[PDB]
Scaffold this active site. Sequence first.
Site, PDB file in Angstrom:
ATOM      1  N   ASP A 156      59.226  35.525  19.338  1.00  0.00           N
ATOM      2  CA  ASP A 156      57.928  35.922  19.860  1.00  0.00           C
ATOM      3  C   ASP A 156      57.991  37.396  20.270  1.00  0.00           C
ATOM      4  O   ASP A 156      59.082  37.955  20.464  1.00  0.00           O
ATOM      5  CB  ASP A 156      57.618  35.063  21.071  1.00  0.00           C
ATOM      6  N   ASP A 176      55.095  39.486  22.568  1.00  0.00           N
ATOM      7  CA  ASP A 176      54.643  39.742  23.939  1.00  0.00           C
ATOM      8  C   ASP A 176      55.464  38.950  24.948  1.00  0.00           C
ATOM      9  O   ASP A 176      55.625  37.754  24.813  1.00  0.00           O
ATOM     10  CB  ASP A 176      53.164  39.382  24.123  1.00  0.00           C
ATOM     11  N   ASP A 198      58.465  32.743  25.407  1.00  0.00           N
ATOM     12  CA  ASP A 198      58.236  32.722  26.842  1.00  0.00           C
ATOM     13  C   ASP A 198      56.978  31.988  27.301  1.00  0.00           C
ATOM     14  O   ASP A 198      56.710  31.954  28.499  1.00  0.00           O
ATOM     15  CB  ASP A 198      58.146  34.155  27.373  1.00  0.00           C
TER      16      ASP A 198
HETATM   17  O1  LIG Z   1      47.781  35.184  24.274  1.00  0.00           O
HETATM   18  C1  LIG Z   1      48.244  36.268  24.699  1.00  0.00           C
HETATM   19  O2  LIG Z   1      48.370  36.466  25.924  1.00  0.00           O
HETATM   20  C2  LIG Z   1      49.011  37.185  23.776  1.00  0.00           C
HETATM   21  C3  LIG Z   1      50.406  36.577  23.527  1.00  0.00           C
HETATM   22  O3  LIG Z   1      50.996  37.142  22.334  1.00  0.00           O
HETATM   23  O4  LIG Z   1      48.301  37.378  22.543  1.00  0.00           O
HETATM   24  C4  LIG Z   1      46.956  37.871  22.656  1.00  0.00           C
HETATM   25  O5  LIG Z   1      46.853  39.028  23.501  1.00  0.00           O
HETATM   26  C5  LIG Z   1      47.483  40.230  23.047  1.00  0.00           C
HETATM   27  C6  LIG Z   1      47.125  41.372  23.985  1.00  0.00           C
HETATM   28  O6  LIG Z   1      47.879  41.248  25.193  1.00  0.00           O
HETATM   29  C7  LIG Z   1      47.078  40.604  21.631  1.00  0.00           C
HETATM   30  O7  LIG Z   1      47.959  41.670  21.214  1.00  0.00           O
HETATM   31  C8  LIG Z   1      47.204  39.403  20.687  1.00  0.00           C
HETATM   32  O8  LIG Z   1      46.607  39.703  19.429  1.00  0.00           O
HETATM   33  C9  LIG Z   1      46.438  38.210  21.263  1.00  0.00           C
HETATM   34  O9  LIG Z   1      45.024  38.515  21.304  1.00  0.00           O
HETATM   35 MG   LIG Z   2      55.015  35.683  24.565  1.00  0.00          MG
END
Ligand SMILES: O=C(O)[C@@H](CO)O[C@H]1O[C@H](CO)[C@@H](O)[C@H](O)[C@@H]1O
Ligand SMILES: [Mg+2]
Lengths: 251, 251
Positions: free
Chosen positions: B6, B8, B202
């Site tokens: 993953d 983020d 995570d």
């Molecule tokens: O769900 C989330 O918190 C994150 C986890 O990856 O993705 C969204 O949020 C991110 C922005 O923080 C975008 O980069 C992704 O495209 C998506 O919209």
């Molecule tokens: Mg994540």
Amino acid sequence: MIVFTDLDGTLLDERGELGPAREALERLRALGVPVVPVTAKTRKEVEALGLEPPFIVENGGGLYLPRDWPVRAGRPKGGYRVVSLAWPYRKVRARLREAEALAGRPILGYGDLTAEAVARLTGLSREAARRAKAREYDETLVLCPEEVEAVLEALEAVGLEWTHGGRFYHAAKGADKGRAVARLRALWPDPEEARFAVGLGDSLNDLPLFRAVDLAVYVGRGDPPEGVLATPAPGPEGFRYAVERYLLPRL
Amino acid sequence: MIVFTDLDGTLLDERGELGPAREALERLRALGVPVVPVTAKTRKEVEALGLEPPFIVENGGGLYLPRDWPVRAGRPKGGYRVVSLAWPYRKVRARLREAEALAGRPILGYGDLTAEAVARLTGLSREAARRAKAREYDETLVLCPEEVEAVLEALEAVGLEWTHGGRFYHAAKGADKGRAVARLRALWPDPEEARFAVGLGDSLNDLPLFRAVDLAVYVGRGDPPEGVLATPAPGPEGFRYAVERYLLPRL
Ligand SMILES: O=C(O)[C@@H](CO)O[C@H]1O[C@H](CO)[C@@H](O)[C@H](O)[C@@H]1O
Ligand SMILES: [Mg+2]
Ligand SMILES: O=C(O)[C@@H](CO)O[C@H]1O[C@H](CO)[C@@H](O)[C@H](O)[C@@H]1O
Ligand SMILES: [Mg+2]
């Protein structure tokens, strides 16, 4: 006599048209009674409805006058002169960002949404939604029921004011239908014509309108505010009932 | 060995950058261990990070392969080959409208918001927000915490699937990180190399990732899900720890 009237849910039906109000409007024009829209709607929306100035837009944020209005007021803009009573949209939007940080959660409005989204939320066409997004003073908020109250508290904390129309909450500063009505009456060319004012409406944002006129008529659902006349039916049929029963027999 | 990860909150720091993860990534690259991003992020976001395929986007909705992948699968799309596992975004968006009708309220997603609004909501730059809005399969939802429960039931009732990443809920149909990882492992040119898979993550949307791999490592902030290894610290420091302690010895 001047008739000040809200649009949505008062002069306009569920499809944003006149219904039985058409005939009522014609009778008033024939008698030479000015009709002044007073609405949360933007100028672009009022224009698309074929309504000529003077009119009051965005909950009293702007007073649009014919360019050649006999009383000098406002700033010239094309075929209009505009009296701005409220803070500009951009400043409201900046204040909203501070309200966000305060609320600790997003506060979304039309400014954050595509025209497509506004259209879906409002039942308007994409084009009508584009006109609804062309806001000069007032922001229309998109709030989940459960968060409304926390948001309203945060708005006030950062110096903004709020009200609601038929369906949406609004944030602005200095936009009040009553203030705008009082101003327009004071700017009316013939004082005698403005001496007696009527005001018709259906929601919270119309309370100030009711206070600012001599004869108030509520055409919303349920009981009218204290001191305000009621009609058997709501909306445009209410408007028609009101003109025939309360106005014409005075003209 | 293949490391599926993953982005983020796992490989990326709080600014969505690879800086802190560099050393650990180079450790893997130097040892010829392939690293495959598996993310809720879009193809455009992954490219902006300079990450090359194969990679898995939008919670497993799309598997991207190099144009010259030895195993012919999917269809040519902008210099890659893509294997679409999930419904297209357009279908998800349409089914969301049914969900809204059931819930009796708006359900907003990135598709309803301007890049400016998305940027404000996410802390991304305006440019990055446009890339986050370029969604092919999965919608990121923007929901009042108080409405989540009702909304999630509405999604289920209309045949949509939901999950959540670090901060946002998502709606899609057929997008599952595990399903995509399994498909990529089956399309891998070197069956031996794909025989042992590692998955790091995570958040909730990573549970399917953990189920699809042979060694699962959680670098989020709670206790880990059952059967998944933990690290002393979350995020990229957790990723680095996992490489040094769990993977290198094994290599
Ligand atoms: O769900 C989330 O918190 C994150 C986890 O990856 O993705 C969204 O949020 C991110 C922005 O923080 C975008 O980069 C992704 O495209 C998506 O919209
Ligand atoms: Mg994540
Ligand atoms: O608050 C509302 O419910 C109405 C007035 O009753 O105004 C908003 O909603 C209308 C659409 O229903 C728009 O035309 C206006 O510009 C404004 O955004
Ligand atoms: Mg109204």
